[PDB]
Amino acid sequence: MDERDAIVEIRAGTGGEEAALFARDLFNMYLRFAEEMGFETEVLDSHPTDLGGFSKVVFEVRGPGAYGTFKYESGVHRVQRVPVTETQGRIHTSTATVAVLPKAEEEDFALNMDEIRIDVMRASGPGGSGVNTTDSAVRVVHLPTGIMVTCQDSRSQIKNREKALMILRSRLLEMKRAEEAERLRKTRLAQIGTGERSEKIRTYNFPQSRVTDHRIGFTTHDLEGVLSGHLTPILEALKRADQERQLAA
Amino acid sequence: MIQPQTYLEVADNTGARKIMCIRVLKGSNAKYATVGDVIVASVKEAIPRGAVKEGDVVKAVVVRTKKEIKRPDGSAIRFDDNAAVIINNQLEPRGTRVFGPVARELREKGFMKIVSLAPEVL
RNA sequence: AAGUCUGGGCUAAGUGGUAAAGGAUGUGGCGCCGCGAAGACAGCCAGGAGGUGGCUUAGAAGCAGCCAUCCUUUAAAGAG
RNA sequence: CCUAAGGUAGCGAAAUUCCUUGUCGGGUAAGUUCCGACCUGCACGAAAAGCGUAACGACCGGAGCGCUGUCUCGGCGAGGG
RNA sequence: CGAUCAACGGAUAAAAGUUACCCCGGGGAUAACAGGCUGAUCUCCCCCGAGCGUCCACAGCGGCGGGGAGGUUUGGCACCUCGAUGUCGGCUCGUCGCAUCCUGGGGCUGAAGAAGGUCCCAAGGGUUGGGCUGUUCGCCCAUUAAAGCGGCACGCGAGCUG
RNA sequence: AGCGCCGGCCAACUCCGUGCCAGCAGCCGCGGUAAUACGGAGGGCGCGAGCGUUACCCGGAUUCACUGGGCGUAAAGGGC
RNA sequence: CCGAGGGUAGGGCCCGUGACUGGGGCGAAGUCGUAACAAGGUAGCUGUACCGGAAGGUGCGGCUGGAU
RNA sequence: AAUGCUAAU
RNA sequence: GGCGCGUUAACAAAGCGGUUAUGUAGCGGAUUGCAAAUCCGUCUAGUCCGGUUCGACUCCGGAACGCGCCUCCA
Ligand SMILES: [K+]
Ligand SMILES: [Mg+2]
Ligand SMILES: [Mg+2]
Ligand SMILES: [Mg+2]
Ligand SMILES: [Mg+2]
Ligand SMILES: [Mg+2]
Ligand SMILES: [Mg+2]
Ligand SMILES: [Mg+2]
Ligand SMILES: [Mg+2]
Ligand SMILES: [Mg+2]
Ligand SMILES: [Mg+2]
Ligand SMILES: [Mg+2]
Ligand SMILES: [Mg+2]
Ligand SMILES: [Mg+2]
Ligand SMILES: [Mg+2]
Ligand SMILES: [Mg+2]
Ligand SMILES: [Mg+2]
Ligand SMILES: [Mg+2]
Ligand SMILES: [Mg+2]
Ligand SMILES: [Mg+2]
Ligand SMILES: [Mg+2]
Ligand SMILES: [Mg+2]
Ligand SMILES: [Mg+2]
Ligand SMILES: [Mg+2]
Ligand SMILES: [Mg+2]
Ligand SMILES: [Mg+2]
Ligand SMILES: [Mg+2]
Ligand SMILES: [Mg+2]
Ligand SMILES: [Mg+2]
Ligand SMILES: [Mg+2]
Ligand SMILES: [Mg+2]
Ligand SMILES: [Mg+2]
Ligand SMILES: [Mg+2]
Ligand SMILES: [Mg+2]
Ligand SMILES: [Mg+2]
Ligand SMILES: [Mg+2]
Ligand SMILES: [Mg+2]
Ligand SMILES: [Mg+2]
Ligand SMILES: [Mg+2]
Ligand SMILES: [Mg+2]
Ligand SMILES: [Mg+2]
Ligand SMILES: [Mg+2]
Ligand SMILES: [Mg+2]
Ligand SMILES: [Mg+2]
Ligand SMILES: [Mg+2]
Ligand SMILES: [Mg+2]
Ligand SMILES: [Mg+2]
Ligand SMILES: [Mg+2]
Ligand SMILES: [Mg+2]
Ligand SMILES: [Mg+2]
Ligand SMILES: [Mg+2]
Ligand SMILES: [Mg+2]
Ligand SMILES: [Mg+2]
Ligand SMILES: [Mg+2]
Ligand SMILES: [Mg+2]
Ligand SMILES: [Mg+2]
Ligand SMILES: [Mg+2]
Ligand SMILES: [Mg+2]
Ligand SMILES: [Mg+2]
Ligand SMILES: [Mg+2]
Ligand SMILES: [Mg+2]
Ligand SMILES: [Mg+2]
Ligand SMILES: [Mg+2]
Ligand SMILES: [Mg+2]
Ligand SMILES: [Mg+2]
Ligand SMILES: [Mg+2]
Ligand SMILES: [Mg+2]
Ligand SMILES: [Mg+2]
Ligand SMILES: [Mg+2]
Ligand SMILES: [Mg+2]
Ligand SMILES: [Mg+2]
Ligand SMILES: [Mg+2]
Ligand SMILES: [Mg+2]
Ligand SMILES: [Mg+2]
Ligand SMILES: [Mg+2]
Ligand SMILES: [Mg+2]
Ligand SMILES: [Mg+2]
Ligand SMILES: [Mg+2]
Ligand SMILES: [Mg+2]
Ligand SMILES: [Mg+2]
Ligand SMILES: [Mg+2]
Ligand SMILES: [Mg+2]
Ligand SMILES: [Mg+2]
Ligand SMILES: [Mg+2]
Ligand SMILES: [Mg+2]
Ligand SMILES: [Mg+2]
Ligand SMILES: [Mg+2]
Ligand SMILES: [Mg+2]
Ligand SMILES: [Mg+2]
Ligand SMILES: [Mg+2]
Ligand SMILES: [Mg+2]
Ligand SMILES: [Mg+2]
Ligand SMILES: [Mg+2]
Ligand SMILES: [Mg+2]
Ligand SMILES: [Mg+2]
Ligand SMILES: [Mg+2]
Ligand SMILES: [Mg+2]
Ligand SMILES: [Mg+2]
Ligand SMILES: [Mg+2]
Ligand SMILES: [Mg+2]
Ligand SMILES: [Mg+2]
Ligand SMILES: [Mg+2]
Ligand SMILES: [Mg+2]
Ligand SMILES: [Mg+2]
Ligand SMILES: [Mg+2]
Ligand SMILES: [Mg+2]
Ligand SMILES: [Mg+2]
Ligand SMILES: [Mg+2]
Ligand SMILES: [Mg+2]
Ligand SMILES: [Mg+2]
Ligand SMILES: [Mg+2]
Ligand SMILES: [Mg+2]
Ligand SMILES: [Mg+2]
Ligand SMILES: [Mg+2]
Ligand SMILES: [Mg+2]
Ligand SMILES: [Mg+2]
Ligand SMILES: [Mg+2]
Ligand SMILES: [Mg+2]
Ligand SMILES: [Mg+2]
Ligand SMILES: [Mg+2]
Ligand SMILES: [Mg+2]
Ligand SMILES: [Mg+2]
Ligand SMILES: [Mg+2]
Numbered sequence: 001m002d003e004r005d006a007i008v009e010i011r012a013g014t015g016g017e018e019a020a021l022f023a024r025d026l027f028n029m030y031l032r033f034a035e036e037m038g039f040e041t042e043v044l045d046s047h048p049t050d051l052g053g054f055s056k057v058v059f060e061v062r063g064p065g066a067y068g069t070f071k072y073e074s075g076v077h078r079v080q081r082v083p084v085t086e087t088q089g090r091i092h093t094s095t096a097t098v099a100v101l102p103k104a105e106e107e108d109f110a111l112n113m114d115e116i117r118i119d120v121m122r123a124s125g126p127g128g129s130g131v132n133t134t135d136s137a138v139r140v141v142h143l144p145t146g147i148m149v150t151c152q153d154s155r156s157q158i159k160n161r162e163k164a165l166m167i168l169r170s171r172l173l174e175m176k177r178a179e180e181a182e183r184l185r186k187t188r189l190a191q192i193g194t195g196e197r198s199e200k201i202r203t204y205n206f207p208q209s210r211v212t213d214h215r216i217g218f219t220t221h222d223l224e225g226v227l228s229g230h231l232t233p234i235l236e237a238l239k240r241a242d243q244e245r246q247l248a249a
Numbered sequence: 250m251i252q253p254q255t256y257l258e259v260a261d262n263t264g265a266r267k268i269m270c271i272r273v274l275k276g277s278n279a280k281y282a283t284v285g286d287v288i289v290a291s292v293k294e295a296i297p298r299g300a301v302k303e304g305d306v307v308k309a310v311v312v313r314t315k316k317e318i319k320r321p322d323g324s325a326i327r328f329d330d331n332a333a334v335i336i337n338n339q340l341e342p343r344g345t346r347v348f349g350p351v352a353r354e355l356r357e358k359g360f361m362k363i364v365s366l367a368p369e370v371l
Numbered sequence: 372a373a374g375u376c377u378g379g380g381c382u383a384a385g386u387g388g389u390a391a392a393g394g395a396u397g398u399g400g401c402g403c404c405g406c407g408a409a410g411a412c413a414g415c416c417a418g419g420a421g422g423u424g425g426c427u428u429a430g431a432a433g434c435a436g437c438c439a440u441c442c443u444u445u446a447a448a449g450a451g
Numbered sequence: 452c453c454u455a456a457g458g459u460a461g462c463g464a465a466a467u468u469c470c471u472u473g474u475c476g477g478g479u480a481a482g483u484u485c486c487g488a489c490c491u492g493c494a495c496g497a498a499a500a501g502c503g504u505a506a507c508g509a510c511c512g513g514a515g516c517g518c519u520g521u522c523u524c525g526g527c528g529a530g531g532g
Numbered sequence: 533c534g535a536u537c538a539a540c541g542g543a544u545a546a547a548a549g550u551u552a553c554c555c556c557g558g559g560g561a562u563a564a565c566a567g568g569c570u571g572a573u574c575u576c577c578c579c580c581g582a583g584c585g586u587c588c589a590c591a592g593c594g595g596c597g598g599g600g601a602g603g604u605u606u607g608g609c610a611c612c613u614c615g616a617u618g619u620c621g622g623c624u625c626g627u628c629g630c631a632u633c634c635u636g637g638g639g640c641u642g643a644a645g646a647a648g649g650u651c652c653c654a655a656g657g658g659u660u661g662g663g664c665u666g667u668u669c670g671c672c673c674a675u676u677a678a679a680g681c682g683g684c685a686c687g688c689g690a691g692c693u694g
Numbered sequence: 695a696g697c698g699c700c701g702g703c704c705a706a707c708u709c710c711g712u713g714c715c716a717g718c719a720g721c722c723g724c725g726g727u728a729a730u731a732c733g734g735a736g737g738g739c740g741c742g743a744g745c746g747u748u749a750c751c752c753g754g755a756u757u758c759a760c761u762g763g764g765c766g767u768a769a770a771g772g773g774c
Numbered sequence: 775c776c777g778a779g780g781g782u783a784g785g786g787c788c789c790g791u792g793a794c795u796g797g798g799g800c801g802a803a804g805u806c807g808u809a810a811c812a813a814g815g816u817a818g819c820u821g822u823a824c825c826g827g828a829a830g831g832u833g834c835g836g837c838u839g840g841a842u
Numbered sequence: 843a844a845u846g847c848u849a850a851u
Numbered sequence: 852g853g854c855g856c857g858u859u860a861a862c863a864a865a866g867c868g869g870u871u872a873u874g875u876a877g878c879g880g881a882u883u884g885c886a887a888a889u890c891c892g893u894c895u896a897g898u899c900c901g902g903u904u905c906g907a908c909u910c911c912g913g914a915a916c917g918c919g920c921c922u923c924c925a
């Protein structure tokens with residue numbers, strides 16, 4: 001929801017070291033823009049380039065209403081300029097990718113023993129008169145999923161029931177942590193895509209001091225101000241077409 | 250007298266050659282199937298490009314048995330093999346032709362289309 | 372083996388003759404205030420209304436959730 | 452950081468894998484076994500040899516065909532008791 | 533004066549393992565099976581009524597806590613049995629309990645009908661065949677009115693299997 | 695009266711919009727804010743009850759060479 | 775007797791398909807190095823052999839399509 | 843001795 | 852569960868009852884067309900709780916966490 005704290009992932013796209021340099025240009029843009037909006041920023045993952053850029057930078061935006069504003073910057077951002085890494089004064093079209101995500105909880109995972117069945121039974125293998133007559137072997141079933149764990153590592157039904165429940169949780173936890181990864185992944189590829197020059201959401205053309213946002217048909221010429229944080233123009237212009245979009249029917 | 254494991258020839262053109270009985274669909278625990286009784290079977294042998302294929306779990310009605318069938322007029326009939334026509338859940342045949350004779354019992358048990366398509370009814 | 376012994380009382384569950392939180396117009400007995408022929412309690416005969424909803428709601432308008440629950444014909448009628 | 456040096460080729464859920472009936476594929480109507488793969492090998496590994504190998508085996512697995520009183524499910528008959 | 537004779541009343545100046553190749557003398561003075569006592573564990577049933585259930589605590593549910601029953605499991609204890617109480621599973625043969633899987637009879641339903649849910653009465657009878665595994669248990673296939681859970685030395689080896 | 699075409703091959707050019715987007719394409723290549731190469735327009739070229747596209751055959755291909763090719767280093771002398 | 779064809783059993787060739795596996799082509803950006811083209815900074819290339827994350831390195835012989 | 847330099851006439 | 856070991860900064864990893872560990876990173880500077888390599892400088896610490904002591908990262912006890920080994924005759 002638009003009121004949650006958000007997490008911005010800026011990755012470097014097509015363009016090599018200049019892509020990483022432009023990635024840093026996006027990075028300082030959002031940090032400064034955030035500070036002007038009140039939101040706190042903390043970096044979590046940075047991968048700098050010795051030329052000053054970032055292969056990838058992940059930072060959170062801590063403030064009431066971060067996903068409301070920053071959500072509009074998810075996509076491929078196109079730069080066109082004469083790179084500092086170019087020697088023959090050429091204009092290279094490079095790109096960066098920015099992913100914006102709602103900050104996840106953590107949500108402690110616990111077994112609901114009412115959807116868990118525990119079977120006890122005689123074990124297998126050695127043990128003489130003991131193994132013959134002892135219900136030391138444990139099964140544990142997560143009844144909704146059906147996934148089970150068995151254990152007869154010890155001679156104690158209690159130590160075995162404990163080791164089996166512990167494993168059932170650890171396994172269920174991984175299944176839960178993995179369906180989320182799929183969600184976190186399909187969602188990123190809905191924003192970043194391949195990172196190509198096309199799929200662009202907004203071009204920053206330095207030779208013509210222009211910044212165009214191709215979704216709404218908006219362009220300004222305050223490029224120095226855009227790349228410094230004064231993004232509030234384009235956001236409002238985006239919000240407008242979004243409200244004009246919500247017109248039924 | 251057909252039971253689980255019993256192999257039956259297939260007297261239709263579904264492409265099935267041999268079905269192996271796996272259930273007598275007669276109440277809770279019928280031991281044997283005779284003429285007119287539906288069984289469940291898996292298709293053990295078939296021919297290429299037919300409707301049914303090796304491995305399907307189909308239904309079928311027994312049409313010919315090697316154990317003689319007895320009759321109220323004191324006679325009895327005996328066939329050289331165990332045969333079945335593969336059917337659908339509404340008890341209708343799934344092929345379009347029935348090969349060989351069939352027991353007249355099938356008439357009195359609702360299998361007219363099978364009795365119709367059969368070349369001889371004994 | 373020795374009382375179908377005497378006198379007073381309780382129990383109706385064969386309780387006696389196997390159990391707990393807890394539930395109960397079981398039964399008996401003590402209390403303590405309360406209301407009554409300023410006609411009580413029960414039943415029955417009515418009045419049981421009106422401005423009509425107040426935030427919320429397309430109706431929620433006496434009869435979802437929130438706000439406090441104003442007053443008159445009065446013998447009393449609650450915005451219930 | 453440590454060690455005397457940090458498992459090479461080959462092989463691997465194995466006569467070795469605890470979690471385990473791992474996972475995927477095959478076979479079956481259905482396969483904790485089996486076969487083929489994968490490799491986070493609890494706890495393979497190179498003459499206490501490693502990986503293969505035609506032939507051989509009253510060795511030990513898995514499957515099909517044939518055929519059966521093993522079985523559904525028992526019946527009768529013979530002789531010695 | 534010389535003792536971590538520290539196993540500290542200190543066996544020698546001087547001493548570690550292993551036995552499924554094992555042995556004898558003993559013990560139910562003491563473990564593993566079963567029984568017994570107990571009932572933490574296990575199974576079942578209640579009390580309370582926060583909250584859910586559009587509305588509505590109680591159709592179906594029941595936070596935090598509370599009280600019990602049973603004697604299938606895992607334990608505690610070490611009381612008969614160590615001059616022997618044969619131990620898993622299967623097979624065979626049953627019999628009992630009822631906290632009932634089906635079938636019979638009911639009340640409530642968030643029960644239109646059909647089909648369910650839930651609880652009450654009820655133990656007469658019934659409660660299938662297969663794949664995997666030594667398995668019990670469990671999964672799966674195909675059915676079924678249903679494919680019940682327990683006790684009987686985890687029933688039953690002077691009945692069989694192994 | 696329509697259809698194809700107007701960067702070069704190849705006959706036929708200008709204005710607007712677009713801005714490596716949308717698109718063009720047989721090859722070489724066009725398009726990233728002054729595009730005869732995209733789209734439309736005016737004009738032009740070619741054919742005309744037809745004009746284009748696709749598939750295939752032969753040609754261009756002396757690029758399987760009989761006509762009519764090659765093998766030191768371009769593909770190509772067999773290790774002897 | 776022959777005989778369409780049906781059945782049985784064992785071979786041959788071909789096509790599709792298969793967990794997994796092997797490399798190959800491709801890519802306006804990634805990671806590690808820098809083997810080759812200058813004597814490419816150890817002349818290169820070569821057949822083979824052994825070894826190595828990788829390009830490669832080294833041994834033996836060969837070639838000049840090698841510099842000064 | 844001494845490594846590297848992406849991508850738009 | 853028993854027994855043993857540990858917990859230090861960005862990471863890895865040491866000594867120590869009072870006190871610049873160290874390596875590599877990171878930061879400032881140089882060199883370089885630029886990046887590295889290189890050179891000159893530089894810097895961030897001891898898991899919680901309770902003890903002992905003048906003073907505890909250091910010693911004693913407990914907790915959490917991680918590692919190692921054992922869990923056998925039935
Ligand atoms: K032993
Ligand atoms: Mg990264
Ligand atoms: Mg350059
Ligand atoms: Mg339970
Ligand atoms: Mg056991
Ligand atoms: Mg076993
Ligand atoms: Mg043993
Ligand atoms: Mg026991
Ligand atoms: Mg047939
Ligand atoms: Mg077929
Ligand atoms: Mg088959
Ligand atoms: Mg098949
Ligand atoms: Mg048919
Ligand atoms: Mg036939
Ligand atoms: Mg009397
Ligand atoms: Mg008297
Ligand atoms: Mg009573
Ligand atoms: Mg009594
Ligand atoms: Mg009583
Ligand atoms: Mg009571
Ligand atoms: Mg009382
Ligand atoms: Mg090893
Ligand atoms: Mg080595
Ligand atoms: Mg080697
Ligand atoms: Mg290896
Ligand atoms: Mg393996
Ligand atoms: Mg396996
Ligand atoms: Mg192996
Ligand atoms: Mg092993
Ligand atoms: Mg295993
Ligand atoms: Mg195992
Ligand atoms: Mg399985
Ligand atoms: Mg399969
Ligand atoms: Mg087959
Ligand atoms: Mg499988
Ligand atoms: Mg088997
Ligand atoms: Mg295998
Ligand atoms: Mg694995
Ligand atoms: Mg070995
Ligand atoms: Mg050795
Ligand atoms: Mg060995
Ligand atoms: Mg050796
Ligand atoms: Mg050997
Ligand atoms: Mg081998
Ligand atoms: Mg060989
Ligand atoms: Mg061999
Ligand atoms: Mg062999
Ligand atoms: Mg042999
Ligand atoms: Mg042998
Ligand atoms: Mg021999
Ligand atoms: Mg067979
Ligand atoms: Mg066989
Ligand atoms: Mg067979
Ligand atoms: Mg017999
Ligand atoms: Mg006999
Ligand atoms: Mg006799
Ligand atoms: Mg000592
Ligand atoms: Mg002593
Ligand atoms: Mg001593
Ligand atoms: Mg003393
Ligand atoms: Mg002495
Ligand atoms: Mg001495
Ligand atoms: Mg001694
Ligand atoms: Mg000894
Ligand atoms: Mg011994
Ligand atoms: Mg031994
Ligand atoms: Mg031995
Ligand atoms: Mg011996
Ligand atoms: Mg002996
Ligand atoms: Mg002896
Ligand atoms: Mg002995
Ligand atoms: Mg003895
Ligand atoms: Mg003795
Ligand atoms: Mg004694
Ligand atoms: Mg005793
Ligand atoms: Mg003693
Ligand atoms: Mg004992
Ligand atoms: Mg015991
Ligand atoms: Mg004992
Ligand atoms: Mg015990
Ligand atoms: Mg016993
Ligand atoms: Mg005992
Ligand atoms: Mg006893
Ligand atoms: Mg109890
Ligand atoms: Mg008790
Ligand atoms: Mg309890
Ligand atoms: Mg109760
Ligand atoms: Mg209640
Ligand atoms: Mg509610
Ligand atoms: Mg209600
Ligand atoms: Mg509860
Ligand atoms: Mg209690
Ligand atoms: Mg109790
Ligand atoms: Mg209790
Ligand atoms: Mg309890
Ligand atoms: Mg008991
Ligand atoms: Mg008992
Ligand atoms: Mg014990
Ligand atoms: Mg016990
Ligand atoms: Mg005692
Ligand atoms: Mg004994
Ligand atoms: Mg005796
Ligand atoms: Mg005796
Ligand atoms: Mg004896
Ligand atoms: Mg005896
Ligand atoms: Mg009852
Ligand atoms: Mg009933
Ligand atoms: Mg009923
Ligand atoms: Mg009912
Ligand atoms: Mg009904
Ligand atoms: Mg009820
Ligand atoms: Mg009954
Ligand atoms: Mg079986
Ligand atoms: Mg089988
Ligand atoms: Mg089983
Ligand atoms: Mg099992
Ligand atoms: Mg029913
Ligand atoms: Mg059912
Ligand atoms: Mg069954
Ligand atoms: Mg029983
Ligand atoms: Mg027993
Ligand atoms: Mg039993
Ligand atoms: Mg027994």
Ligand SMILES: [Mg+2]
Nearest residue numbers: 688689690691
């Ligand atoms: Mg007995």
Ligand SMILES: [Mg+2]
Nearest residue numbers: 689692693694
């Ligand atoms: Mg025996």
Ligand SMILES: [Mg+2]
Nearest residue numbers: 620621689693
């Ligand atoms: Mg037995």
Ligand SMILES: [Mg+2]
Nearest residue numbers: 618689690691
């Ligand atoms: Mg006996």
Ligand SMILES: [Mg+2]
Nearest residue numbers: 688689690691
């Ligand atoms: Mg006996």
Ligand SMILES: [Mg+2]
Nearest residue numbers: 617618689690
């Ligand atoms: Mg006996």
Ligand SMILES: [Mg+2]
Nearest residue numbers: 620666693694
């Ligand atoms: Mg044995």
Ligand SMILES: [Mg+2]
Nearest residue numbers: 511666693694
């Ligand atoms: Mg044996």
Ligand SMILES: [Mg+2]
Nearest residue numbers: 698699740746
């Ligand atoms: Mg044209």
Ligand SMILES: [Mg+2]
Nearest residue numbers: 703704705740
């Ligand atoms: Mg032309």
Ligand SMILES: [Mg+2]
Nearest residue numbers: 700704705706
């Ligand atoms: Mg021209």
Ligand SMILES: [Mg+2]
Nearest residue numbers: 699718719732
């Ligand atoms: Mg065109």
Ligand SMILES: [Mg+2]
Nearest residue numbers: 080203713726
């Ligand atoms: Mg542009």
Ligand SMILES: [Mg+2]
Nearest residue numbers: 711712713727
């Ligand atoms: Mg323009």
Ligand SMILES: [Mg+2]
Nearest residue numbers: 726727728729
């Ligand atoms: Mg231009």
Ligand SMILES: [Mg+2]
Nearest residue numbers: 710711728729
């Ligand atoms: Mg233009």
